[PDB]
Amino acid sequence: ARLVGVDLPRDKRMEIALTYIYGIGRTRSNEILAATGIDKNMRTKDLTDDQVTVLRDYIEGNLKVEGDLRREVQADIRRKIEIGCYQGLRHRRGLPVRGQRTKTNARTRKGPKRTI
Amino acid sequence: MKTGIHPEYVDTTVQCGCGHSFTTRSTKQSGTIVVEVCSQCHPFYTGKGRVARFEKRYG
Amino acid sequence: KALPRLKQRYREEIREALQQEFNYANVMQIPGVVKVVVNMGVGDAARDAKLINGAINDLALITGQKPEVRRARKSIAQFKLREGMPIGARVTLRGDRMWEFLDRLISIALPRIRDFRGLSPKQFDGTGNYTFGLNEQSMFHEIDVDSIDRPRGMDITVVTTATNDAEGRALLRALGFPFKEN
Amino acid sequence: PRSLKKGPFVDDHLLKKVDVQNEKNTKQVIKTWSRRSTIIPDFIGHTFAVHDGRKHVPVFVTEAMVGHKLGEFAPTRTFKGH
RNA sequence: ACACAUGCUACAAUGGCCGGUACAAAGGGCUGCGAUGCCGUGAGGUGGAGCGAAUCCUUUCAAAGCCGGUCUCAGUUCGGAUCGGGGUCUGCAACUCGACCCCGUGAAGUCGGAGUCGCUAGUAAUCGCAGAUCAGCAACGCUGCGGUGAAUACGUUCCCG
RNA sequence: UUGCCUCCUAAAAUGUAACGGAGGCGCCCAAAGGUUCCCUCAACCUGGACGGCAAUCAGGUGUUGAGUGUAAGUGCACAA
Numbered sequence: 001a002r003l004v005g006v007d008l009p010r011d012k013r014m015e016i017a018l019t020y021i022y023g024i025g026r027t028r029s030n031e032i033l034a035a036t037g038i039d040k041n042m043r044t045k046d047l048t049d050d051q052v053t054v055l056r057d058y059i060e061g062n063l064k065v066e067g068d069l070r071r072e073v074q075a076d077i078r079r080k081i082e083i084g085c086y087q088g089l090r091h092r093r094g095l096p097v098r099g100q101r102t103k104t105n106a107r108t109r110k111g112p113k114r115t116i
Numbered sequence: 117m118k119t120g121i122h123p124e125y126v127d128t129t130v131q132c133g134c135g136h137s138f139t140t141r142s143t144k145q146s147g148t149i150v151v152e153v154c155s156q157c158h159p160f161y162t163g164k165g166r167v168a169r170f171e172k173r174y175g
Numbered sequence: 176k177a178l179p180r181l182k183q184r185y186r187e188e189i190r191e192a193l194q195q196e197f198n199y200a201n202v203m204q205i206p207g208v209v210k211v212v213v214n215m216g217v218g219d220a221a222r223d224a225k226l227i228n229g230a231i232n233d234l235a236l237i238t239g240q241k242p243e244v245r246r247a248r249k250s251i252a253q254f255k256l257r258e259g260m261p262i263g264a265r266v267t268l269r270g271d272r273m274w275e276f277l278d279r280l281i282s283i284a285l286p287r288i289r290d291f292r293g294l295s296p297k298q299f300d301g302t303g304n305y306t307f308g309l310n311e312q313s314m315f316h317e318i319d320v321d322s323i324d325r326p327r328g329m330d331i332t333v334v335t336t337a338t339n340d341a342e343g344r345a346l347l348r349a350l351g352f353p354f355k356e357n
Numbered sequence: 358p359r360s361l362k363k364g365p366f367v368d369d370h371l372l373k374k375v376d377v378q379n380e381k382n383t384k385q386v387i388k389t390w391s392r393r394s395t396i397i398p399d400f401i402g403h404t405f406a407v408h409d410g411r412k413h414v415p416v417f418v419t420e421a422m423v424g425h426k427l428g429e430f431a432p433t434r435t436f437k438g439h
Numbered sequence: 440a441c442a443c444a445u446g447c448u449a450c451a452a453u454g455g456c457c458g459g460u461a462c463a464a465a466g467g468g469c470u471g472c473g474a475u476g477c478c479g480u481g482a483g484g485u486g487g488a489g490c491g492a493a494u495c496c497u498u499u500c501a502a503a504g505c506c507g508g509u510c511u512c513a514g515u516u517c518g519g520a521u522c523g524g525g526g527u528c529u530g531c532a533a534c535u536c537g538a539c540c541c542c543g544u545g546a547a548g549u550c551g552g553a554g555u556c557g558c559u560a561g562u563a564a565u566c567g568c569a570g571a572u573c574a575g576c577a578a579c580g581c582u583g584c585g586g587u588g589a590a591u592a593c594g595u596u597c598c599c600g
Numbered sequence: 601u602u603g604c605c606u607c608c609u610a611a612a613a614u615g616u617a618a619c620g621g622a623g624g625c626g627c628c629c630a631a632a633g634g635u636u637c638c639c640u641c642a643a644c645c646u647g648g649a650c651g652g653c654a655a656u657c658a659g660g661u662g663u664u665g666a667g668u669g670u671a672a673g674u675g676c677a678c679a680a
């Protein structure tokens with residue numbers, strides 16, 4: 001189907017299908033589908049246009065998802081990067097921000113291994 | 117209008133969840149398009165601080 | 176004994192709107208819109224001749240008339256390109272079809288853009304013609320999501336009789352085009 | 358994070374110093390060794406010399422910096438690379 | 440910017456997730472262990488029954504197990520790193536530097552080259568539990584406790600001592 | 601080095617030497633030939649999803665600076 005700018009996968013149970021939306025994950029799925037009253041055990045084939053309407057209305061109502069969410073998170077990172085906060089210096093360097101161990105690991109921040 | 121080379125241009129009717137109807141030309145051979153969002157629906161057409169975040173917590 | 180809706184809305188309202196706003200000496204100097212050109216530059220058609228055949232079906236489905244392939248008129252090294260390799264496709268829209276496409280685009284396609292914050296008013300060039308790009312052909316409804324190989328972008332340009340950017344902006348504004356304000 | 362039940366932490370030392378500073382309307386450079394006090398709206402325009410352990414660093418508090426501990430804006434260790 | 444070493448979690452279907460249900464051993468407790476109840480979604484909050492403890496609390500204590508449903512081989516309902524927001528508790532104080540919870544985020548990774556290590560039965564493999572240090576914890580460590588439980592040993596030519 | 605083609609030398613017809621100065625050729629094309637009909641570049645400016653000095657799209661300025669299978673000259677926008 002089509003929901004909030006996304007394209008829902010061909011066959012998935014709806015609680016898994018809604019997770020392709022960038023602002024939603026399994027728990028928010030078991031919230032949204034409980035509130036709307038749409039069974040989570042349905043396919044994406046058996047979804048209707050009306051059901052898509054109730055869904056879009058609800059999750060645009062109480063939840064921020066997708067593009068606005070990304071813009072907002074990016075906005076938080078550049079917010080703390082500008083004020084010259086410690087975490088900001090870390091984001092600049094491309095190192096681990098949470099106080100983790102940079103002597104050995106941290107490759108997921110640094111990226112692939114570049115030898116000397 | 118060279119005769120054969122073009123895709124067929126049908127008459128078409130566009131229907132929306134907000135009730136708006138449109139009568140247009142389209143390439144859809146059915147001749148009917150049901151669509152979710154339009155010029156009337158969309159929140160852009162219709163127009164839809166750290167210290168505050170501090171005083172909300174503590175105040 | 177027939178009529179497209181936007182041609183109608185133009186002839187009856189917008190015309191008088193602009194005539195009240197800009198106070199033209201003659202009724203002729205009223206800007207109308209000449210043509211709408213749609214263009215898909217491929218560029219990887221230098222490497223693969225198959226992609227052009229995808230571009231063709233795209234435009235031909237979206238517009239409703241068969242595209243016109245363009246040769247490369249120069250030969251360039253860095254882009255791996257010679258003269259006579261088909262590079263990109265172009266469709267010119269005039270009269271009725273122009274109007275109907277403009278309407279489907281204004282009323283349907285553009286509201287279906289992912290994170291649509293509107294269009295920049297700044298895209299006019301000096302003469303009051305308006306060009307804007309698009310990232311993915313998935314927005315249009317005559318094109319099926321199911322059948323796409325790969326998202327491909329296209330340029331839409333609306334070229335007008337407008338003399339400057341003010342007049343053109345006013346014309347498209349009146350026409351239902353979603354401009355941001357700055 | 359410190360729990361909300363306790364409220365935000367500012368040591369009484371620079372609490373008193375910044376109060377005396379903004380009641381006389383003078384904005385001075387206050388010399389503080391406390392890394393551990395969170396920033397309050399009372400501090401919003403002032404300027405601090407904070408201890409990084411080797412020296413005192415100039416810190417101009419702005420609006421964006423509220424809700425943060427002081428030490429974050431004076432970095433400790435120096436790394437210029439290899 | 441790196442290289443080494445020991446570990447843990449993985450790369451999935453002998454599996455993941457939801458629901459129901461059965462079985463341990465050992466331990467720990469005074470300004471300590473803290474129950475029913477109530478408030479939370481959950482870390483926990485309020486509260487203090489009862490215990491210097493074969494009695495009370497750690498729930499009657501487990502998890503893998505068994506029954507059932509769903510997922511259908513995919514970078515996925517696999518994987519959890521990373522990062523954003525929002526919290527709780529300890530503590531004069533969680534910035535440099537704590538743990539935990541909640542929402543989102545969802546990277547490498549498709550059984551790993553040359554090489555190399557451990558193990559001969561309640562052993563390997565796998566599953567949780569407790570303890571010491573300790574206000575809190577970098578515990579995936581260490582010392583113990585039990586659960587379920589294999590394969591193979593022709594034989595001394597070869598490598599090691 | 602030796603034949604053929606173009607410029608300069610060459611002294612405003614033609615012609616004109618040197619072991620004077622520069623280059624080319626010993627082919628290509630079944631269309632790059634014949635004809636009818638249509639069109640105008642290069643460069644520069646503004647604007648456009650990848651896309652950048654430069655790909656394709658739009659608009660503007662631009663009388664010839666592009667382009668002519670292949671050297672160079674004489675020509676060709678009236679178009680060769």
Ligand SMILES: [Mg+2]
Pocket residue numbers: 302303304334335336337338
């Ligand atoms: Mg114009």
Ligand SMILES: [Mg+2]
Pocket residue numbers: 443444
């Ligand atoms: Mg070593």
Ligand SMILES: [Mg+2]
Pocket residue numbers: 446447579
């Ligand atoms: Mg370890």
Ligand SMILES: [Mg+2]
Pocket residue numbers: none
């Ligand atoms: Mg395990």
Ligand SMILES: [Mg+2]
Pocket residue numbers: none
């Ligand atoms: Mg697991």
Ligand SMILES: [Mg+2]
Pocket residue numbers: none
């Ligand atoms: Mg999982």
Ligand SMILES: [Mg+2]
Pocket residue numbers: none
């Ligand atoms: Mg269970």
Ligand SMILES: [Mg+2]
Pocket residue numbers: none
């Ligand atoms: Mg025993």
Ligand SMILES: [Mg+2]
Pocket residue numbers: none
């Ligand atoms: Mg409860």
Ligand SMILES: [Mg+2]
Pocket residue numbers: none
């Ligand atoms: Mg029970």
Ligand SMILES: [Mg+2]
Pocket residue numbers: none
């Ligand atoms: Mg996953």
Ligand SMILES: [Mg+2]
Pocket residue numbers: none
């Ligand atoms: Mg990979």
Ligand SMILES: [Mg+2]
Pocket residue numbers: 549
């Ligand atoms: Mg696999």
Ligand SMILES: [Mg+2]
Pocket residue numbers: none
């Ligand atoms: Mg191997």
Ligand SMILES: [Mg+2]
Pocket residue numbers: none
């Ligand atoms: Mg032995």
Ligand SMILES: [Mg+2]
Pocket residue numbers: 573
């Ligand atoms: Mg401890």
